[PDB]
């Protein structure tokens, strides 16, 4: 939403249609399931609590759904669609080159909590791969 209503950037009327359609998709029951908040009628209500000054939050229902690396692809490729649309207008943009470096750093470092997610993202956005990188990927599988 902030992208659609920013004055520093000047997006042509073609691009802004892409952004406004993406805004509608993310509120569909399809994407509520990907983010893991299915069975919630509205996201806003759960995010905020009215009596947040009087009492502290009381979390419960420790039962926690699982996450599947196939869901992360759908999210990781929806966001990549938005970013590229903007880069067409903004000349000599560096957004995609900065994101790739950040992902490429966690992909090849041992961390059992971030490495799986930082690999599904390195491949979904990267535009070039070399033999030296493939050797590492096949040796993380070994």
């Amino acid at each position: 939403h902030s992208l659609c209503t920013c004055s520093q950037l000047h997006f042509s009327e073609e691009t802004k249609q892409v952004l406004r359609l993406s805004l509608t998709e993310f509120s569909l029951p399809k994407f509520y399931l990907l983010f893991g908040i299915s069975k919630v009628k509205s996201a806003a209500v759960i995010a905020f609590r009215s009596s947040y000054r009087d009492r502290s939050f009381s979390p419960g229902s420790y039962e926690r759904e699982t996450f599947a690396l196939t869901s992360l692809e759908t999210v990781t490729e929806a966001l990549l669609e938005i970013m590229e649309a903007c880069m067409r207008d903004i000349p000599t943009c560096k957004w995609l080159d900065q994101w790739t470096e950040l992902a490429q750093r966690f992909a090849f470092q041992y961390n059992p909590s971030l490495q799986p997610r930082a690999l599904v993202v390195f491949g979904c956005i990267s535009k070039r791969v070399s033999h030296g990188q493939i050797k590492q990927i096949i040796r993380i599988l070994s």
Binding site: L21, T24, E25, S27, L28, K30
Partner: protein, 550 residues
């Protein structure tokens, strides 16, 4: 079935005009011409009348059939483009059907089209609405036998165990080749109409609303059908993904508007409507009688040619306050005795407003309710005291009124000095309220309407109302005319004189006020204040007002 209903709509919507235009002239000759006089088109020996010679009946029936048969073949060009495409698809379907399987694809198409489209009109023209009055049974018999002979030609089948009609078998032999040419011409349309092009690209606003409503109702089920198939490629760029996204974006459809008219369906014609109203007891409803008092579409003397004149007052009809069918019956009832002969109709659109208007659906019915031949008997149409609002309405409803675009029968009174010459003075009975104005007050010639565009307008400050007459011609339905807006004095709620160069005239529910420039604005505003003040005395209680916020 669904496929069947597609044909019915296609033929009925476009075929009606083609059949009536062609068949109508032929029906006049047999029905009315003294030359035909009285003759029996019967060849049945059991029913054969000794008084009339069998040969005379047989030859006359054969001669009559030739007249109709020749007309059908000749009018190849008049075939609508829509049906031409419809025939080609069937031809390709049969041709493709033949390939996988001496049957002629054209033969099957020709017999089908003739049997379901041309044949029904000939057998019973009265039901189709071609003829107002049911043909006499003796004339009806000839049409029935005529259809059978014509149908045999398409199938190239001789008379077997049909000795009654066997003598006629000779005639069909010559015309077998002729029938083939007519079918081939329509069937010869290119599979892709690269050459035949008509980029009308009409908005069709009314249709779109129904489409959006239909999709919303079946949102869930239509999605499941797409989900089952299309696994080969992700549906993200395929209908199911787009449908959910777009449909959610638009939001729920708006509620449908109400229908003043009785329930109606595709199966509607002039004959059908007349019977329905007759069975209904509209005479004693006490709402039909009120129309007589309103004096709507009343006969008034005659014209230069001597044809009777009628005057329809736009003011007298409210958009929804009364059922629209009762007005139709009154107009049809009054025109029924005389509409056969040429007639002139004059429509009074003085002080037209959105309150008195015709909706898209209700407007269309007028084209069909009447028998159809009366439209050709429209000697002339005169429009008086038109205003800008009408022009805007015409642009939106151009599609329905495209037939009247550039119509010779439409006569526009550009200035008062023209109608008085053409119409019989001392007989025209234009509205008394209209006559009350009399356009007999001061004219501020060469006043300029300051706006996005400047148009010279002559303003008359009438005794009871203000008339703004444009001095620049406008194009309405392809005929030039000068717009003459009329604003009642009572409707002039606000009168502000911003400056001596121009004054402000705000009117109820008109958004931005009306500003004009004249060398003496205070003279104009002075009179308007005097005119407005006079009304205040006339009204019993002006103080009670407002209490309404838009």
């Amino acid at each position: 079935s669904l496929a069947s209903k597609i044909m019915t709509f296609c033929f009925k919507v476009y075929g009606a005009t083609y059949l009536q235009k062609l068949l109508d002239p032929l029906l006049r000759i047999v029905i009315t011409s003294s030359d035909w006089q009285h003759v029996s088109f019967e060849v049945d020996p059991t029913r054969l009348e000794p008084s009339e010679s069998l040969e005379e009946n047989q030859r006359n029936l054969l001669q009559m059939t030739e007249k109709f048969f020749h007309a059908i073949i000749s009018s190849s060009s008049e075939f609508p483009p829509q049906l031409r495409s419809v025939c080609h698809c069937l031809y390709q379907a049969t041709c493709h059907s033949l390939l996988n399987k001496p049957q002629n694809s054209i033969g099957a198409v020709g017999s089908a089209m003739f049997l379901r489209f041309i044949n029904p009109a000939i057998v019973s023209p009265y039901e189709a609405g071609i003829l107002d009055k049911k043909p006499p049974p003796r004339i009806e018999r000839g049409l029935k036998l005529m259809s059978k002979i014509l149908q045999s030609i398409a199938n190239h089948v001789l008379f077997t165990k049909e000795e009654h009609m066997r003598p006629f078998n000779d005639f069909v032999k010559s015309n077998f080749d002729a029938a083939r040419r007519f079918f081939l011409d329509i069937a010869s349309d290119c599979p892709t109409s690269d050459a035949v092009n008509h980029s009308l690209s009409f908005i069709s606003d009314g249709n779109v609303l129904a489409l959006h409503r239909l999709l919303w109702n079946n949102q869930e089920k239509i999605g499941q059908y797409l989900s089952s198939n299309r696994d080969h490629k992700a549906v993200g760029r395929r209908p199911f993904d787009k449908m959910a996204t777009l449909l959610a974006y638009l939001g729920p459809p708006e509620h449908k508007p109400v229908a003043d008219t009785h329930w109606s369906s595709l199966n509607l014609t002039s004959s059908k409507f007349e019977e329905f109203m007759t069975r209904h007891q509209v005479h004693e409803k006490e709402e039909f009688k009120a129309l007589k008092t309103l004096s709507i579409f009343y006969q008034a003397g005659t014209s230069k040619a001597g044809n009777p004149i009628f005057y329809y007052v736009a003011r007298r009809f409210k958009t929804g306050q009364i059922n629209g069918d009762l007005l139709i019956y009154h107009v049809l009832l009054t025109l029924k005795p005389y509409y056969a002969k040429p007639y002139e109709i004059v429509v009074d659109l003085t002080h037209t407003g959105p309150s008195n208007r015709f909706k898209t659906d209700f407007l269309s019915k007028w084209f069909v309710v009447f028998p159809g031949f009366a439209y050709d008997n429209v000697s002339a149409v005169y429009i008086y005291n038109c205003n800008s609002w009408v022009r805007e309405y015409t642009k939106y409803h151009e599609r329905l009124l495209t037939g009247l675009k550039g119509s010779k029968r439409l006569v526009f009174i550009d200035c008062p000095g023209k109608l008085a010459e053409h119409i019989e003075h001392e007989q025209q009975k234009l509205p008394a309220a209209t006559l009350a104005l009399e356009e007999d007050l001061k004219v501020f010639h060469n006043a300029l309407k300051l706006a996005h565009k400047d148009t010279k307008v002559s303003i008359k400050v009438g005794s009871t109302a203000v008339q703004v007459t444009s001095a620049e011609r406008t194009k309405v339905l392809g005929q030039s005319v000068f717009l003459n807006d009329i604003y009642y004095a009572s409707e002039i709620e606000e009168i502000c004189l911003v400056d001596e160069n121009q004054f402000t005239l705000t009117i109820a529910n008109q958004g931005t006020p009306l500003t004009f420039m004249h060398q003496e604005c205070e003279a104009i505003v002075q009179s308007i204040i005097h005119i407005r003040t006079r009304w205040e005395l006339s009204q019993p209680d002006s103080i009670p007002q407002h209490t309404k916020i838009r």
